[PDB]
Specification:
Strand order of the largest sheet of chain A: 1-9-8-11-12-13-10
Largest sheet of chain A: 7 strands, antiparallel
Number of strands of chain B: 1
Radius of gyration of chain B: 5 Å
Number of helices of chain A: 2
Structural class of chain A: mainly beta
Bound molecules: calcium ion
Number of strands of chain A: 13
CATH topology of the largest domain in chain A: Thrombin, subunit H
Shape of chain A: globular
Radius of gyration of chain A: 16 Å
InterPro entries (chain A): Peptidase_S1_PA, Peptidase_S1_PA_chymotrypsin, Peptidase_S1A, Serine_Proteases_S1, Trypsin_dom, TRYPSIN_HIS, TRYPSIN_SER
CATH class of the largest domain in chain A: Mainly Beta
Subcellular location (chain A): Secreted, Extracellular space
Oligomer: heterodimer
Strand content of chain A: 25-35%
Order of helices and strands of chain B: E
EC number (chain A): 3.4.21.4
CATH superfamily of the largest domain in chain A: Trypsin-like serine proteases
Largest sheet of chain B: none
Helix content of chain A: under 10%
Helix content of chain B: under 10%
Number of domains of chain A: 2
Main location (chain A): secreted
Strand content of chain B: 15-25%
Number of helices of chain B: 0
Distance between the termini of chain B: 6 Å
Shape of chain B: flat
Subunit structure (chain A): Interacts with SERPINA1.
Largest interface: A-B, 28 and 9 residues
Chain lengths: ~220, ~10
């Protein structure tokens, strides 16, 4: 996250870190046994880390649980990033409490101007590399489809939305992928892609979760 | 444009 602030330990209880010997993507806990993340974060050997703040030090409240299976959307296209969403089933149920809780799925899509919270352990510099130890937060509004399509002509499908600031300086970045975009207490987006980070006229692009609620529920129900 | 994972996919 570029241009954000320190969230505060466990203030984003649904935030998870996907780890394979190092942090590589974020994700959101949607119930005691399932995490939602981005399809491009897929890999074997994923350990899900819940209740994290400083990802480099064990401080208490952490729960490390192995992924039992990862389900990438059948129509995910790596070339266009359309349908960039993945479900991860945990090997055992997480213990839910004040420091580890799930986030609700949306019943309706959000509209332009809606304020949301994006969080993650990604790069904090628009130019260069600097990974934080603690979870960073950023409040950002959802942009209109017309502004989104103007920024990325021919690259925005109906399953994506832009969020952020056209003036630059505030954005999600490498390492934030798969993480949550929460608005009004509902998970509306998943950190997916963008051109650089915090660049002027190049807002972040996110997977539009409200288009997948049915798929998520049916998939979870049969697994 | 790149995905925001580690490492990024462009
Ligand atoms: Ca820790």
């Amino acid at each position: 996250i570029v241009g954000g602030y320190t969230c505060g330990a466990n203030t984003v209880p649904y935030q998870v870190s996907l780890n394979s010997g190092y942090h590589f993507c974020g994700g959101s806990l949607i119930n005691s046994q399932w995490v939602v993340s981005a399809a491009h974060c897929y890999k074997s050997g994923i350990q899900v880390r819940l209740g994290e703040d400083n990802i480099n030090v064990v401080e208490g409240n952490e729960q490390f649980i192995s992924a039992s299976k990862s389900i990438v959307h059948p129509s995910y296209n790596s070339n266009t990033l359309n349908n960039d969403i993945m479900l991860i089933k945990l090997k055992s149920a997480a213990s839910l409490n004040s420091r580890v809780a799930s986030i609700s799925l949306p019943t309706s899509c959000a509209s332009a101007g809606t304020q949301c919270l994006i969080s993650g352990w990604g790069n904090t510099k628009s130019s260069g590399t600097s990974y934080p130890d603690v979870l960073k937060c950023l409040k950002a509004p959802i942009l209109s489809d017309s502004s989104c399509k103007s920024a990325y002509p021919g690259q925005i499908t109906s399953n994506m939305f832009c969020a952020g600031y056209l003036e630059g300086g505030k954005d999600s970045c490498q390492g934030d992928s798969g993480g949550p975009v929460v608005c009004s207490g509902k998970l509306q987006g998943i950190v997916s892609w963008g051109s650089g980070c915090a660049q002027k006229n190049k807002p972040g692009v996110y997977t539009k979760v409200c288009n997948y609620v049915s798929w998520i529920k049916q998939t979870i129900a049969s697994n | 444009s790149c995905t925001r994972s580690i490492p990024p996919q462009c």
